[PDB]
RNA sequence: CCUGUCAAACUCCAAACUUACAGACGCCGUUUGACGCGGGGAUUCCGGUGCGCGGGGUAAGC
RNA sequence: CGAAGAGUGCAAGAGCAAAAGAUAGCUUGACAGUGUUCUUCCCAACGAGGAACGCUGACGCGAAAGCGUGGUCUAGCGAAC
RNA sequence: UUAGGCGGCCACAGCGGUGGGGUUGCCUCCCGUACCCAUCCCGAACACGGAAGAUAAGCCCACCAGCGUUCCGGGGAGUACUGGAGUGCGCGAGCCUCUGGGAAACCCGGUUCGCCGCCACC
């Protein structure tokens, strides 16, 4: 199904699992990447900031995450970097798949609501920003236009 | 208090001094209360009323001021209790108080009890109080006969020093008599 | 004391807003009213804010408008210094104008129609789709600004 | 509403704030009001009896005599005037 | 200072938790006064398909009845330490529980103006061993 | 301990706002009688649109 | 240690701790007559049904105030002939 | 209030902690079961009778702000949200300006270790 069907916050928050059942698992493999054994004690901290409020399905969350991290293997399988996708897909989404009769939909997926300006991804690295390219690929697979933002780096 | 939601009991509940459930059923009457309280050495009777900022004691008597009328005996017994009830009752009468309802607080409604004697006293003072003669002591005990006959099983004087030797409930008869007519602070 | 002038019609105007204008004695576009500054009145005029032009006028402007537009509570009589003198607690239009501004009286209290029925603004106003700060004619004005308006509607 | 009983949609208004939980003080369950006195109507979550229909919470009526211990309070529901039987526990003097 | 601080024995509860008895007969002989039965809350597979029913009995001894018992009961026991409650209590064994506490205890057992005993007036494991040991026998 | 997130059927908080009653000012009523009461006569119980807030639906001139 | 997460017949939300819960004992108010008010039906007319609150009668328990017009509250209901 | 009784508001009063106080008005702990009354077993409690002892409990007085709570100043924030208006912007979900209101979390510093009523009483 197209992102067109769910990218907008056009429905009330539907996340209570005590009342919703049969929610598909998440396609997002991990939320912590890189040397997650270590702390965010790095020199440079870049982040991908979404420019529009939107709902991002776990479908796109996993494609963007892979697209970025997989590429961040320009540093090495066990390289010296950190990477965190900080949002979780809490919104349960449905699809009415009798025409418009009794059309409440059936759970078909989950998405993460992200407001304009929130950062969806954050990386921590040493002056080794192959990450800015990692996000160019990441922002390439999520609905909104985004802006890559270096948070702590005067090391031009 | 563990946090924001923690519920702290009302103060007088915290202090275990006021049974608010009984207090309510008590106030329903609309009548004043004959608050009967007691201690190890003394007894106290107060006629209390409801007030915008707290209760109002319109009259009252304490076993301590029982002496002022000729009491030379201990102050934590039945005769003392009855008398105090009568003293407070009489004072209540003067103050314009006509009727009341017994408030024994956290005490137990034990037959023959002093709280009940405090009550018989107030009723004899002329105060109209809902009661039950079947739960009141048998008069002779009120006079303190139970204490005299106990001294009969002497071997050693009951009261260390004090007055008498064999005790006198008759002393009680004298005080009840002294109280039922005239005298100051009444 | 503020001068209140309805510049936007009644159609599609919320009813409690139009009801307020009527309580301030204005029932037509271009009619004006002198409302004293009280918490009570302030709430009223704030409610009407988007359909009116208001502000404190100068003694001179208020005098011009009274001379040119004020009317008797009943009748087509001319309100001039002679009229004001022989009918009001005042001696001339100025005295009146001064009392109104100092809020010691009202047009009705002196036997005048509460409203001052103005003429359309000569050379037109700044527009009824934007407030003063945005270049429109709606809302609160400078004493200089409110004067420009009233003079044009003289 | 999905149902139409006396307590439909009363989740919020008939619930005590955690600290107001537990038996309420008897002082106000015994308060005396005079005919003509303006009184605010609000059910006390902790008090079971003497309640009025929840729909009337918020009303400020005029006491007009009593029935037994409960009070008879006049109010105007919309444009219709009704009389409400209500015990002190659920009332507070105005001002 | 002391005296109103020195340990006391407030109750010795001897009980047998069978799960069925006439055991009351012996518990009454070894103690001196009449025993009382104990019901069992909650039902269990071990054939306790009855909630309110006799499972055991007990006896609470206070004052002399308690001492006259401990004088012939303590010799029967052995252990000490790592067998004492935080409240300066200790139980051994038919079970035998000894409840120790300081003079101003009634303040937390009466009806009027109750109050929970301050941790400073609360007896201690050590203070307990002492008192007992300091009375016809040895510790650990 | 630290670290990353949420709620139509969660709430330690908490608006704008809506609402009861009263007072004040305004407006209005006492020859245009208001507010209220009684009686006669209806028509009406396919509505629609914009705006705000919506719930359903990928959406719709749904 | 522990304001309440237990329990209170059953949905859900709400109420309850010297109790509205537990245990024990006693008891039959799950009583008769007749109303007020609200609800049903917001506003605003409409029956059966319901509830809160009175007056009268007769009672139970309690020292007594008092509590009991069924089960803590909101479902468990039916016209004329 | 050199220690009491009944309360109102019901944590600004809770939790925890330090220090002080009793020939006596007192409150207690305390001592004791002939009686009234009591233990489904215990004068533990309840109840009754009483003062040899004590200020260690409680209690009353003075105090500490680590936790919880009430309120206030500063920052967050006139931010978030929002009643009214707009031929203002945006492909659009949506945003903005003007006008009238206006949080919450959190940080920092103060406050708070109850206040008040009636009766009694060296
Ligand atoms: Cl007492
Ligand atoms: Mg004219
Ligand atoms: Mg000390
Ligand atoms: Na309450
Ligand atoms: Na002390
Ligand atoms: Sr929608
Ligand atoms: Sr078809
Ligand atoms: Sr994109
Ligand atoms: Sr509304
Ligand atoms: Sr009931
Ligand atoms: Sr004893
Ligand atoms: Sr498009
Ligand atoms: Sr402001």
TL;DR?
Chain D: GO terms for molecular function: rRNA binding; structural constituent of ribosome. The structure is cut from a larger assembly and holds chains A (156 residues), B (186 residues), C (154 residues), D (95 residues) and E (140 residues). Chain B contains seven helices and four strands; from the N terminus they run H-H-E-E-E-H-E-H-H-H-H.
Quickly list its features.
part of a larger assembly; 5 chains; A: 156 residues; alpha+beta; Aldehyde Oxidoreductase, domain 3; five-stranded antiparallel beta sheet; 2 helices; elongated; C: 154 residues; Ribosomal Protein L30, Chain: A; 3-methyladenine DNA Glycosylase II, Chain A, domain 3; five-stranded mixed beta sheet; binds chloride ion; binds magnesium ion; binds sodium ion; binds strontium ion; RNA-binding; ribonucleoprotein (chain E); RNA-binding (chain E); structural constituent of ribosome (chain E); rRNA binding (chain E)
Biggest sheet features of chain B = 4 strands, mixed
The value of Rg of chain B in angstroms is 18 Å
What is the class of chain D in the CATH system?
Mainly Beta
Tally of domains of chain D: 1
> What structural category arises from helix and sheet content of chain D?
mainly beta
CATH superfamily of chain D: Ribosomal protein L21
> Strand order across the biggest sheet of chain B?
3-2-1-4
Q: Which structural class fits the helix and strand makeup of chain B? A: alpha+beta
Q: Number of DSSP helices of chain B?
A: 7
Number of domains of chain B: 1
- General shape of chain B: globular
CATH topology name of chain B, in short, is: Nucleotidyltransferase, domain 5
Second CATH tier, the architecture of chain D: Roll
Q: What gap, in angstroms, lies between the N and C termini of chain D?
A: 35 Å
What compounds are bound to the protein? chloride ion, magnesium ion, sodium ion, strontium ion
PDB class: ribosome
Keywords: Ribosome, Protein Translation, Macrolide binding
Entry title: Crystal Structure of Enhanced Macrolide Bound to 50S Ribosomal Subunit
Chain A: 50S ribosomal protein L10e
Description of the molecule:
- The structure is cut from a larger assembly and holds chains A (156 residues), B (186 residues), C (154 residues), D (95 residues) and E (140 residues).
- With 186 residues, chain B is an alpha+beta fold.
- Chain B is built from seven helices and four strands; from the N terminus they run H-H-E-E-E-H-E-H-H-H-H.
- With 154 residues, chain C is an alpha+beta fold.
- Chain C folds into two domains: 1-57 and 114-154, 2-Layer Sandwich (Ribosomal Protein L30, Chain: A), CATH 3.30.1390.20; 58-113, 3-methyladenine DNA Glycosylase II, Chain A, domain 3 (Orthogonal Bundle).
- Chain C starts with a strand and ends with a helix.
- Chain E has one domain (1-140): 50s Ribosomal Protein L5, Chain: A (2-Layer Sandwich).
- The chains are: A alpha+beta (156), B alpha+beta (186), C alpha+beta (154), D mainly beta (95), E alpha+beta (140).
- The interface between B and E is small, with 7 and 5 residues.
- The structure holds chloride ion (CL), magnesium ion (2 copies), sodium ion (NA) (2 copies) and strontium ion (SR) (8 copies).
- Chain B: Belongs to the universal ribosomal protein uL18 family.
- Chain B: This is one of 5 proteins that mediate the attachment of the 5S rRNA onto the large ribosomal subunit, where it forms part of the central protuberance and stabilizes the orientation of adjacent RNA domains.
